[PDB]
Amino acid sequence: GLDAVRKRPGMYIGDTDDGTGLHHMVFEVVDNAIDEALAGHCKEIIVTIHADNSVSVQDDGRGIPTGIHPEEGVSAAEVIMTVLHGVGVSVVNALSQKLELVIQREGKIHRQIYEHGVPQAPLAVTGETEKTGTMVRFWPSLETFTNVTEFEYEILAKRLRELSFLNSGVSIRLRDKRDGKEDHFHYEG
Numbered sequence: 001g002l003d004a005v006r007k008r009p010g011m012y013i014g015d016t017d018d019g020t021g022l023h024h025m026v027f028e029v030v031d032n033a034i035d036e037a038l039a040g041h042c043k044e045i046i047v048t049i050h051a052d053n054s055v056s057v058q059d060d061g062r063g064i065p066t067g068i069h070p071e072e073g074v075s076a077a078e079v080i081m082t083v084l085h086g087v088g089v090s091v092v093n094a095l096s097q098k099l100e101l102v103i104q105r106e107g108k109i110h111r112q113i114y115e116h117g118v119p120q121a122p123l124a125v126t127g128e129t130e131k132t133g134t135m136v137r138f139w140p141s142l143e144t145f146t147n148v149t150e151f152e153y154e155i156l157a158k159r160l161r162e163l164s165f166l167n168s169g170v171s172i173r174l175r176d177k178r179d180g181k182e183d184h185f186h187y188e189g
């Protein structure tokens with residue numbers, strides 16, 4: 001359960017004081033965006049540090065499934081976001097004061113807001129779209145993360161570059177809206 005993640009965050013995300021756990025939050029979501037099933041023949045991932053110190057990861061993959069999970073009684077996307085079972089977005093969700101989820105799948109835009117891993121409403125259709133993919137934007141909880149509270153572009157940049165070489169064909173963009181720095185990592189060897 002998510003309550004166990006909030007009680008002992010160190011266990012699930014790593015060190016919550018030296019900044020390493022804070023940045024693992026980002027990498028955990030990125031890994032899911034990389035591991036996502038392709039929608040077309042390529043994948044693009046866009047990592048954005050927003051000017052309110054939130055991070056969003058978006059991909060152009062298939063989209064997290066939105067249909068009602070027959071056994072759980074809520075959208076499959078909600079199950080993924082709220083259940084423990086390379087640890088999962090549910091952990092990131094658990095340790096985020098807010099998380100926004102936008103899914104584009106089956107011609108429809110779906111949106112859901114969480115607070116400390118608790119959904120504020122059911123996953124809802126907000127409009128129409130010709131695109132597909134997932135967008136997770138999260139604001140880390142400062143009840144969890146102490147001392148180092150701010151994301152560091154360079155740490156993100158260095159890691160995504162390393163990943164780039166391991167994931168040929170995948171376009172990885174990094175954008176910092178605080179000062180306008182950006183990078184593009186795209187290996188095709």
Ligand SMILES: CSc1nc(Cl)cc(Cl)n1
Nearest residue numbers: 032033036058059089134
């Ligand atoms: C784009 S962020 C992301 N996160 C998850 Cl949990 C799955 C997928 Cl398909 N993408």
